[PDB]
Design a protein around this nucleic acid. Structure first.
Ligand code: MG
Ligand code: MG
Ligand code: MG
Ligand code: MG
Ligand code: MG
Ligand code: MG
Ligand code: MG
Ligand code: MG
Ligand code: MG
Ligand code: MG
Ligand code: MG
Ligand code: MG
Ligand code: MG
Ligand code: MG
Ligand code: MG
Ligand code: MG
Ligand code: MG
Ligand code: MG
Ligand code: MG
Ligand code: MG
Ligand code: MG
Ligand code: MG
Ligand code: MG
Ligand code: MG
Lengths: 128, 147, 104, 52, 187
RNA sequence: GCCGUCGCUGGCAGUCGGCAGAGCGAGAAAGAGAGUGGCGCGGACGCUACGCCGCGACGAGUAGGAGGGCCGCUGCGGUGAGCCUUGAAGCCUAGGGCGCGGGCCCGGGUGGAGCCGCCGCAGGUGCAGAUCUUGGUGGUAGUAGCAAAUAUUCAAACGAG
RNA sequence: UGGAAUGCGAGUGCCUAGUGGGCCACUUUUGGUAAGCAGAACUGGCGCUGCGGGAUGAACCGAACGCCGGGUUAAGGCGCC
């Protein structure tokens, strides 16, 4: 009974792994979030061979399939029932994701509405 | 607005926009206008020529209101009176000449730069210029003095 | 504390990064520098060039009326040459019509 | 150090000027004091002119 | 790889006005439409001037518009300006003028209307003559700003009548050494 | 093939519909111009023009410069008939994903009362270093050591000892 | 008949950071017996710059960099590594 998208193109991504920060492995103070290394003698920002890589703009995603989940749908945070009618004319290309804070008493009458509206919800069994 | 400034894009670059080789030291040239004659001579001569030396006579107790004399030019002389005085002197036929009192507007000297409209005037002023008086005769008009 | 004393190494390339441009050649170059007495007589010539105007028209309009009795006295193969004429959008309009009618 | 082109400006900030700083944050709180005492005066002199 | 130089790849012209007002950002929409949909190089110049900063479109004076519209031939034409039409109190007679500018000062509206001329807007002009036929483009003096007197060859240089930046001008403000042939030298 | 920049100072207000007639890519400056005489009621999308679309060329970079951030932090004016004891902040997470990235969103857990989205406003606003500051904790390590001044032994008592 | 060829849109104005220790190479070149020495000239590099080769390598040969698929090369190579 899955809610199919309008069209399901082939999603191709030029890179899957994250871009870890230089020397985020020898240390615990260095988190995995990326920071462009600006040191003089640095071996990563000279693009040596076999080193860590750098987030160029070349890795960009195809604009036709950018932000598009593996279900062929884009996404939208939904904070209450009223924010579905905004999405009821984008049915076959966007989906709904009830927020993290919406309690289960409201999230039930939100999944109910999106069910009538045939809008697909990514977390429809969330809280219960 | 700090959020618009240039120190918000300068977080993460070591020298903070100021150089790796030559640091941003405190006063690497002296403070203020120092070295006006020694190591800032090319600048004090290319951009402030004549800044060094004396010239002329001193005047100890100068009072800036003995030498008060604001001037008005002939081009905007006819702007001191209303419009229904210049056009009333246009439509006039008995040769009467409107009296433009300048020291009443706030000028002492009358300089003559602009053209004048062909009609007589009676310019009351404190000081007159030769040309300002000739441009008034050549149109027909009187240069009254008021002490 | 001996430091390098002088060089011109990168200079011939800094000069060409923004090019070496000859000065701005304008017509009507300035007259500063010319000798005083000559430029004083050239100023006396300009100051009085108008003095011979009403006599200058008497000749310009003269030779311009004479311009009337001046001028009113005198007053690769046949194949690809015919195809380059039929294929003219304007000049070949009637050689094209003569062919369009040809198939009736 | 002077830049390329600009003024020779002399700032008069070579004394301990941060000690003797005078801020006008009480200007609105003294305009009301003056107006109040001016109407206490215009009530003390009952029919006499208010300007003096 | 190719051996080109990208020093000048980014042309620095103004793609759009920097202001955010919506009575200008609508004029610029109408004139960008006329500019692209007509073959008149008038609309393109009006648009390119609607982009320009407040220092590149200066004010016009009523007197300079008089003497620029008195030139022989250009009678019964509409004087188009992109800046503002300031007054010029040192002119006594004003003819009738068809005008179209962005602003007209409240003492030049008086004179022009009492004369009997029309004061159009850029939308009125675009409706009267879309291709801009019968117009006279004008623009105020650009070197009028006092700023252009300090520009050029630096002062203290043989025959460089460039104005210096001085706190005040007087007897004892830059008049001593690089100016007197007596004290040192002069240029 | 995809991403981006630059250029074309490119194209698109023509979605001109029974008040209709659906065109401006084609080698050749200019009108699918006017007049003057010889049934069935039908037709996708678009256009936040600060938007959308089409073409080519291009893409290194320290010092430095500039732009764009729907990157992030804290408060202020508005605004979400915003979220929340049917569980907010915070923190943990071999769970699902988004974005080149800064970062972000969901699920599960813990927790117990406040918190956020947008348009603007403001700033003591983003850390890997500074023999940085304060606090906490490791390997060294159950290691060094508990060695100046000769000396202790037996039985009994109290006592869990 | 826009008066040689080929190529390419140019001109102009403000404001301006950083820099003002350099080094190497072909060729010429001064001091010195010479030096991985001191000092100049022209051009190209390293610095600011990865990549394939030279086992290794700031500077040598090739060649300059968005992220990818196929094909072909340069300089170097093809007993095994
Ligand atoms: Mg930098
Ligand atoms: Mg430093
Ligand atoms: Mg800087
Ligand atoms: Mg310095
Ligand atoms: Mg400083
Ligand atoms: Mg000395
Ligand atoms: Mg400096
Ligand atoms: Mg390339
Ligand atoms: Mg780059
Ligand atoms: Mg963990
Ligand atoms: Mg608890
Ligand atoms: Mg604070
Ligand atoms: Mg730290
Ligand atoms: Mg021990
Ligand atoms: Mg002891
Ligand atoms: Mg040196
Ligand atoms: Mg130095
Ligand atoms: Mg040496
Ligand atoms: Mg050497
Ligand atoms: Mg380096
Ligand atoms: Mg260096
Ligand atoms: Mg370089
Ligand atoms: Mg190299
Ligand atoms: Mg070897």
């Amino acid at each position: 009974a899955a809610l199919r998208p309008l069209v399901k193109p082939k999603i191709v991504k030029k890179r899957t792994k994250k871009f870890i920060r230089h020397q985020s492995d020898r240390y615990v103070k260095i988190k995995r979030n990326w920071r462009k290394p600006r040191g003089i003698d640095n071996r990563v920002r000279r693009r040596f061979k076999g080193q860590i890589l750098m987030p160029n703009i070349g890795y960009g995603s195809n604009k036709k399939t950018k932000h598009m989940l593996p279900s062929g749908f884009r996404k939208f945070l939904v904070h209450n029932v009223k924010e579905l009618e905004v999405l009821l004319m984008c049915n076959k290309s966007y989906c709904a994701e009830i927020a993290h804070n919406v309690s289960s008493k409201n999230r039930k009458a939100i999944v109910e509405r999106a069910a009538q509206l045939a809008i697909r919800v990514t977390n429809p069994n969330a809280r219960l | 607005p700090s959020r618009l400034r240039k120190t918000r894009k300068l977080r993460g670059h070591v020298s903070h926009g100021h150089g790796r080789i030559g640091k941003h030291r405190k006063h690497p040239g002296g403070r203020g206008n120092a070295g006006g004659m020694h190591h800032h001579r090319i600048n004090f001569d290319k951009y402030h020529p004549g800044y060094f030396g004396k010239v002329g006579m001193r005047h100890y107790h100068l009072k800036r209101n003995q030498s008060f004399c604001p001037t008005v030019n002939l081009d905007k002389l006819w702007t001191l009176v209303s419009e229904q005085t210049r056009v009333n002197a246009a439509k006039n036929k008995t040769g009467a000449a409107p009296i433009i009192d300048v020291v009443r507007s706030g000028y002492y000297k009358v300089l003559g730069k602009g053209k004048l409209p062909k009609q007589p005037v009676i310019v009351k002023a404190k000081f007159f210029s030769r040309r300002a008086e000739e441009k008034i005769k050549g149109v027909g008009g009187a240069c009254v003095l008021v002490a | 504390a001996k430091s390098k004393n002088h060089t011109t190494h990168n200079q011939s390339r800094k000069w060409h990064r923004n090019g070496i441009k000859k000065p701005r050649s304008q017509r009507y170059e300035s007259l500063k520098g010319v000798d005083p007495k000559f430029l004083r007589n050239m100023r006396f010539a300009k100051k009085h060039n108008k003095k011979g105007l009403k006599k200058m028209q008497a000749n310009n309009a003269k030779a311009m009326a004479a311009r009337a009795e001046a001028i009113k006295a005198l007053v690769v193969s046949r194949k690809l040459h015919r195809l380059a004429y039929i294929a003219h959008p304007k000049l070949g309009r009637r050689a094209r019509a003569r062919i369009a009618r040809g198939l009736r | 150090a002077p830049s390329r082109n600009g003024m020779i400006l002399k700032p008069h900030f070579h004394k301990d000027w941060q000690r003797r700083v005078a801020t006008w944050f009480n200007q609105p709180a003294r305009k009301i004091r003056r107006r109040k005492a001016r109407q206490a005066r215009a009530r003390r002199i009952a029919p006499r002119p208010a300007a003096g | 790889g190719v051996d080109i130089r990208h020093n000048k790849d980014r042309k620095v012209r103004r793609k759009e006005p920097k202001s955010q007002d919506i009575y200008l950002r609508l004029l610029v929409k109408l004139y960008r439409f006329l500019a692209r949909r007509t073959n008149s190089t008038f609309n393109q110049v009006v648009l390119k001037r609607l982009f320009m900063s407040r220092t590149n479109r200066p004010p016009l004076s009523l007197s300079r518009m008089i003497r620029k519209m008195k030139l022989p031939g250009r009678e019964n034409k509409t004087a188009v300006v992109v800046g503002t039409v300031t007054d010029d109190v040192r002119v006594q007679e004003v003819p009738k003028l068809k005008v179209c500018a962005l602003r007209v000062t409240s003492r030049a509206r008086s004179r022009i209307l009492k004369a009997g001329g029309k004061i159009l807007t850029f939308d009125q002009l675009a409706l009267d003559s879309p291709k801009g036929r019968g117009t006279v483009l004008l623009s105020g003096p650009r070197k009028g700003r006092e700023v252009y007197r300090h520009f050029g060859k630096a002062p203290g240089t043989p025959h460089s009548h460039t104005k210096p930046y001085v706190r005040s001008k007087g007897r004892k403000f830059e008049r001593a050494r690089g100016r007197r042939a007596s004290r040192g030298y002069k240029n």
